[PDB]
Amino acid sequence: SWLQQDTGIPEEEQELLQASGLALNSAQPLTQYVIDCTVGDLIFLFDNRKISLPAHPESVSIVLQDPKRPLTYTHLRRVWGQIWQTIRALKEDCARLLQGQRTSMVNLLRYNTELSKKKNSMTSECEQLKAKLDFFRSSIQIDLEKYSEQMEFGITSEKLLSAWREMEQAVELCGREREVQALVDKMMALQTDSVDLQRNPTLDDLEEQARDLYRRLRERPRDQRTPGDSNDMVRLLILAIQSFEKRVILIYDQLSKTVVCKRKALELSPKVKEVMNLMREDEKIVVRRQEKRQQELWNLLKIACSKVR
Amino acid sequence: KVKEVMNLMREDEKIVVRRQEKRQQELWNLLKIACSKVR
Amino acid sequence: QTIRALKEDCARLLQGQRTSMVNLLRYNTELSKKKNSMTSECEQLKAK
Incomplete structure (x- = not known):
């Protein structure tokens, strides 16, 4: 639900694949699928035909650097x-x-x-x-x-x-x-x-x-x-x-x-x-x-x- | 093994189904007996 | 240089092998698949 909630491709087109090994054994609660922090992850697909898409992060300083090159104090x-x-x-x-x-x-x-x-x-x-x-x-x-x-x-x-x-x-x-x-x-x-x-x-x-x-x-x-x-x-x-x-x-x-x-x-x-x-x-x-x-x-x-x- | 031993397979099943043509030959010849002996 | 003379070396005996078993992987598949038609025949001559 809360996955369609955000994506909107609802359960009956939802491929939840814990690791590569398996599909999602909705048996257990969600906390068997957790694991974090200390020495894996549910990828998830759409039931259709294919279209890529580069979606990017940023950070100000950087995004100026490249449309530029001049001042370059001590601290790079x-x-x-x-x-x-x-x-x-x-x-x-x-x-x-x-x-x-x-x-x-x-x-x-x-x-x-x-x-x-x-x-x-x-x-x-x-x-x-x-x-x-x-x-x-x-x-x-x-x-x-x-x-x-x-x-x-x-x-x-x-x-x-x-x-x-x-x-x-x-x-x-x-x-x-x-x-x-x-x-x-x-x-x-x-x-x-x-x-x-x-x-x-x-x-x-x-x-x-x-x-x-x-x-x-x-x-x-x-x-x-x-x-x-x-x-x-x-x-x-x-x-x-x-x-x-x-x-x-x-x-x-x-x-x-x-x-x-x-x-x-x-x-x-x-x-x-x-x-x-x-x-x-x-x-x-x-x-x-x-x-x-x-x-x-x-x-x-x-x-x-x-x-x- | 599975080259030559399957040479034999072919033929000593294949000849042992060439003799079936000659096993109707002679039911089919058995007809032209109980038939020449009426004419 | 001698550490580097070993990588030069090891990835030379790994050479040997992965040429002598890319001669196997050949005349395994290449012969011993065609001879797995000679034994689809067996199962024709049987049911036949």
């Missing part, structure tokens, strides 16, 4: 210190949104593999019923090939040669297999796309470089202070915006991508689950009627035989 010891801290406040930040993603696509990478491998047994069940449907391209052709060895009797009926003709080719094209692509194709969609993101990528280099500048200034031994340059301590900030800013599209682009896959792996499941229920029996019954189609060659014998005795 604040301002300088400050500037990396905000550079460091960005690495702190960018890599918490890298958190979000690489929990929400280590829920995909789960219920991709875990479900959509077992359903790639339900479609080994297809390539048996296919090649097996084939003994039955012989069975009911080889037969229909020697009932033309009949002009020297047994041959009447013709209904049990026309009824073969009609079921020659009723079944000749019965095996619904060609799912073999919407099986494999849209299977390899997600065991290659959930492998691009399970991998993953100079912000961190820049703050190691704003490390020294905002250190070498305090290391600048005794008398030099004054010489007042706001300076390239704005360079190392300007950059440490872009390389933050840009590591937050890439992140968001790539959170989106791992809901793209979530959906597809919830559609490309019950198709190649249920549609391959049908595959089975409505090939399997449509090869239970072949026993009863020799039944009647085998019954055709006990005709041209009771009519001699």
Whole structure:
């Protein structure tokens, strides 16, 4: 409630994910989920399609420094210190949104593999019923090939040669297999796309470089202070915006991508689950009627035989 | 193992389903007996 | 320099390995997946 209270995306679109391990076990009260202070955190999503967004803190002194560079008294010891801290406040930040993603696509990478491998047994069940449907391209052709060895009797009926003709080719094209692509194709969609993101990528280099500048200034031994340059301590900030800013599209682009896959792996499941229920029996019954189609060659014998005795 | 041992698998199931064509051959030939012996 | 001569060194024996098991990881996957079709066949020739 009080989460929608502020965001407004209400419970039925609310993904509360304690750590990356789990979803929110609303069992316990909220104080099992606390932990603070002394030697982890409920990220939270929206149920939709993706759009990034750089939202930024400030601090006055800083925000003047950069539209400037002139006066530079003794004490950059604040301002300088400050500037990396905000550079460091960005690495702190960018890599918490890298958190979000690489929990929400280590829920995909789960219920991709875990479900959509077992359903790639339900479609080994297809390539048996296919090649097996084939003994039955012989069975009911080889037969229909020697009932033309009949002009020297047994041959009447013709209904049990026309009824073969009609079921020659009723079944000749019965095996619904060609799912073999919407099986494999849209299977390899997600065991290659959930492998691009399970991998993953100079912000961190820049703050190691704003490390020294905002250190070498305090290391600048005794008398030099004054010489007042706001300076390239704005360079190392300007950059440490872009390389933050840009590591937050890439992140968001790539959170989106791992809901793209979530959906597809919830559609490309019950198709190649249920549609391959049908595959089975409505090939399997449509090869239970072949026993009863020799039944009647085998019954055709006990005709041209009771009519001699 | 699971190369050669599955060479054998194929054939010593596959020949052991090449003899089924010749097991109807001779039900289907059993017809052209109890039929030439009436004409 | 000798501390640095060791990182130079260690990340040389870590070399050895992670070339000799990126020859395994090859001719594991590459051969022993195709031979896991030769044993989808078994389960066709069975039900068949």
